[PDB]
Write an enzyme that holds these catalytic residues in place. Structure first.
Site, PDB file in Angstrom:
ATOM      1  N   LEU A  70      27.108   2.114  32.041  1.00 39.26           N
ATOM      2  CA  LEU A  70      26.579   0.695  31.347  1.00 39.26           C
ATOM      3  C   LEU A  70      26.320   1.151  29.889  1.00 39.26           C
ATOM      4  CD1 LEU A  70      24.541  -0.878  34.158  1.00 39.26           C
ATOM      5  CD2 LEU A  70      26.682  -1.417  33.591  1.00 39.26           C
TER       6      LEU A  70
ATOM      7  N   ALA B 148      23.559   0.234  26.958  1.00 34.49           N
ATOM      8  CA  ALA B 148      22.091  -0.091  26.966  1.00 34.49           C
ATOM      9  C   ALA B 148      21.685  -1.419  26.923  1.00 34.49           C
ATOM     10  CB  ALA B 148      21.415   1.054  26.023  1.00 34.49           C
TER      11      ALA B 148
ATOM     12  N   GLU C 154      37.252  -3.673  27.852  1.00 40.55           N
ATOM     13  CA  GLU C 154      36.222  -2.961  26.886  1.00 40.55           C
ATOM     14  C   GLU C 154      35.524  -1.728  27.800  1.00 40.55           C
ATOM     15  OE1 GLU C 154      35.175  -2.589  24.210  1.00 40.55           O
ATOM     16  OE2 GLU C 154      36.057  -4.203  22.898  1.00 40.55           O
TER      17      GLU C 154
ATOM     18  N   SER D 255      23.613  -7.214  23.002  1.00 38.28           N
ATOM     19  CA  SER D 255      23.883  -6.986  21.475  1.00 38.28           C
ATOM     20  C   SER D 255      24.693  -8.253  20.607  1.00 38.28           C
ATOM     21  CB  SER D 255      24.636  -5.716  21.155  1.00 38.28           C
ATOM     22  OG  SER D 255      25.867  -5.628  21.592  1.00 38.28           O
TER      23      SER D 255
ATOM     24  N   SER E 225      25.187  -1.627  17.119  1.00 33.20           N
ATOM     25  CA  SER E 225      24.320  -0.499  16.748  1.00 33.20           C
ATOM     26  C   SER E 225      25.011   0.611  16.098  1.00 33.20           C
ATOM     27  CB  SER E 225      23.524  -0.109  17.595  1.00 33.20           C
ATOM     28  OG  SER E 225      24.098   0.426  18.750  1.00 33.20           O
TER      29      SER E 225
HETATM   30  O1  LIG Z   1      24.485   5.092  17.551  1.00 30.35           O
HETATM   31  C1  LIG Z   1      25.156   4.713  18.553  1.00 30.35           C
HETATM   32  C2  LIG Z   1      25.324   3.418  18.624  1.00 30.35           C
HETATM   33  C3  LIG Z   1      25.777   3.090  20.145  1.00 30.35           C
HETATM   34  N1  LIG Z   1      26.107   4.160  21.009  1.00 30.35           N
HETATM   35  C4  LIG Z   1      26.507   3.717  22.388  1.00 30.35           C
HETATM   36  O2  LIG Z   1      27.355   2.452  22.168  1.00 30.35           O
HETATM   37  C5  LIG Z   1      26.939   1.655  23.103  1.00 30.35           C
HETATM   38  C6  LIG Z   1      27.074   0.108  22.565  1.00 30.35           C
HETATM   39  O3  LIG Z   1      26.427  -0.317  21.341  1.00 30.35           O
HETATM   40  P1  LIG Z   1      26.215  -1.759  21.306  1.00 30.35           P
HETATM   41  O4  LIG Z   1      25.938  -2.720  22.415  1.00 30.35           O
HETATM   42  O5  LIG Z   1      25.066  -1.618  20.415  1.00 30.35           O
HETATM   43  O6  LIG Z   1      27.309  -2.187  20.341  1.00 30.35           O
HETATM   44  P2  LIG Z   1      28.821  -3.077  20.679  1.00 30.35           P
HETATM   45  O7  LIG Z   1      29.802  -1.878  21.141  1.00 30.35           O
HETATM   46  O8  LIG Z   1      28.691  -3.879  21.794  1.00 30.35           O
HETATM   47  O9  LIG Z   1      28.980  -3.700  19.365  1.00 30.35           O
HETATM   48  C7  LIG Z   1      25.410   1.894  23.125  1.00 30.35           C
HETATM   49  O10 LIG Z   1      25.137   1.304  24.476  1.00 30.35           O
HETATM   50  C8  LIG Z   1      25.392   3.219  23.235  1.00 30.35           C
HETATM   51  O11 LIG Z   1      25.931   3.621  24.335  1.00 30.35           O
HETATM   52  C9  LIG Z   1      25.489   5.436  20.854  1.00 30.35           C
HETATM   53  O12 LIG Z   1      25.444   5.995  21.638  1.00 30.35           O
HETATM   54  N2  LIG Z   1      25.104   5.721  19.426  1.00 30.35           N
HETATM   55 MN   LIG Z   2      26.996  -4.333  23.050  1.00 32.13          MN
END
Ligand SMILES: O=c1ccn([C@@H]2O[C@H](COP(=O)(O)OP(=O)(O)O)[C@@H](O)[C@H]2O)c(=O)[nH]1
Ligand SMILES: [Mn+2]
EC number: 2.4.1.-
Lengths: 304, 87
Positions: free
Chosen positions: A195, A197, A228, A297, A303
């Site tokens: 998963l 985070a 995804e 997020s 992030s």
């Molecule tokens: O600096 C970072 C940013 C994100 N993650 C990984 O990327 C995942 C997805 O991040 P997030 O939900 O913020 O972004 P999204 O992909 O959904 O836009 C996080 O849970 C982490 O496992 C990481 O390892 N380092």
């Molecule tokens: Mn996310």
């Protein structure tokens, strides 16, 4: 029984002792205050808090966090302290994991591809790529002739995508080979629930079910579905869809660990091609659970 | 303007184009389509990914956004040239 591309599959059970795996790869560990665990934990991105709460809820599992980054000695104590405070949390450093069974030399990937391009008629080949390959071959860093080491060095999203796939290939053995306390219960061939985070667990997940033992998050933005990698569940180690994706990462010089290592791997596994309907395939492979609030997020910001 | 930025990217980005595509949030199934249509032409795959991003983001498809994405996925020299040709 679920079916796709003319074949039927079993809904394979992922039992309730399957470990849960999170990931935090930190390019900027200096951004944390002294005494802080170096996993993001802001009001906007309360990710360490989310992980802790998952472990609190799933008290009968191990919750692992695969971590990487140039952590300081004091940060490594904070990870130890975190493990001491939460009985079923395992912090697993990337560099401590044995991935060597999945590696390949970069020089071999390039050479194979050079021969492949040379086997095409001159008017039908990628002449630009053939020239890039010959130059890439000449510029492999000394001591770094390794697919896995080449990603270990990166500090952009493919760093975490690539090791996410390999950690899920390891699955139960990721946990058993740490030797950590509590991991006695898991077997090396056990599955894994990966998963992001921001995937919020609200109650115990219980037994999960996945066609042929794998299922992944499907994002749906504006009626548009997308496979995804922010949740991935497998019922066993070395799941064949992820082996197919690793084979592509070993063969396709412009491969990406998300599009190819996860996405194309699972598509090949189920014989998805341009003949088939992508939305139907998303429906078929989707992992969703009433006790998970997915991808939160989406209410704040990415992030990465 | 965007066209000149695309030209600088296509002139400089090869093997790693998918990292930029992912940073630009080009969808998985659109990458499938690009690869199918340009199986033996890497440079054309980059250009098509940029074109798809432009069509998807509409007016938010700006040079600024493109440069931010290049920097974010660690293509900072490409971003430098883009900003060079722009000014
Ligand atoms: O600096 C970072 C940013 C994100 N993650 C990984 O990327 C995942 C997805 O991040 P997030 O939900 O913020 O972004 P999204 O992909 O959904 O836009 C996080 O849970 C982490 O496992 C990481 O390892 N380092
Ligand atoms: Mn996310």
């Amino acid at each position: 029984r679920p079916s796709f591309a003319g074949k039927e599959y079993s809904l394979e059970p992922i039992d309730e002792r399957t470990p849960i795996l999170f990931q935090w790869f930190e390019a900027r560990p200096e951004r944390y205050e002294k005494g802080e665990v170096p996993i993001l934990n802001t009001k906007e991105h309360p990710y360490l808090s989310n992980i802790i709460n998952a472990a609190k809820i799933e008290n009968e599992r191990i919750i692992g966090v695969l971590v990487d980054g140039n952590f300081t000695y004091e940060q490594k104590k904070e990870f130890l302290n975190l493990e001491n405070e939460h009985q079923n949390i395992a912090i697993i450093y990337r560099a401590d994991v044995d991935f060597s069974m999945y590696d390949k030399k970069l020089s071999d990937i390039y050479l194979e591809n050079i021969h492949k391009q040379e086997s095409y008629p001159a008017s039908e080949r990628d002449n630009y790529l053939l020239g890039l390959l010959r130059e890439e071959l000449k510029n492999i860093p000394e001591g770094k002739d390794s697919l896995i080491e080449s990603y270990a060095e990166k500090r952009e999203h493919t760093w975490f995508d690539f090791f996410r796939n390999l950690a899920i290939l390891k699955a139960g053995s990721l946990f058993t080979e740490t030797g950590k306390t509590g991991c006695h219960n898991i077997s090396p061939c056990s599955g894994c629930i990966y998963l992001d985070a921001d995937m919020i667990i609200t109650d115990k997940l219980g037994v999960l079910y996945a066609p042929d033992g794998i299922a992944v998050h499907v994002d749906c933005n504006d009626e548009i579905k997308s496979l995804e990698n922010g949740a991935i569940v497998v019922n066993r180690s070395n799941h064949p869809a992820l082996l197919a994706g690793l084979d592509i990462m070993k063969s396709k010089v412009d491969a990406h660990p998300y599009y190819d290592g996860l996405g194309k791997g699972i598509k090949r596994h189920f014989n998805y091609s341009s003949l088939h309907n992508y939305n139907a395939f998303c429906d078929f492979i989707e992992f969703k659970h009433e006790n998970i609030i997915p991808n939160t997020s989406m209410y704040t910001s990415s992030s990465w | 303007d965007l066209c000149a930025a695309f030209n600088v990217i296509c002139d400089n980005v090869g093997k790693d184009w998918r990292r930029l595509a992912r940073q630009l949030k080009v969808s998985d199934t659109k990458i499938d389509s690009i690869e199918d249509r340009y199986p033996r032409n890497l440079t054309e795959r980059v250009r098509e990914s940029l074109r798809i991003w432009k069509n998807t983001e509409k007016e938010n498809a700006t040079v600024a956004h493109l440069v931010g994405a290049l920097r974010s996925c660690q293509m900072n020299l490409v971003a430098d040239l883009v900003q060079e040709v722009q000014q």
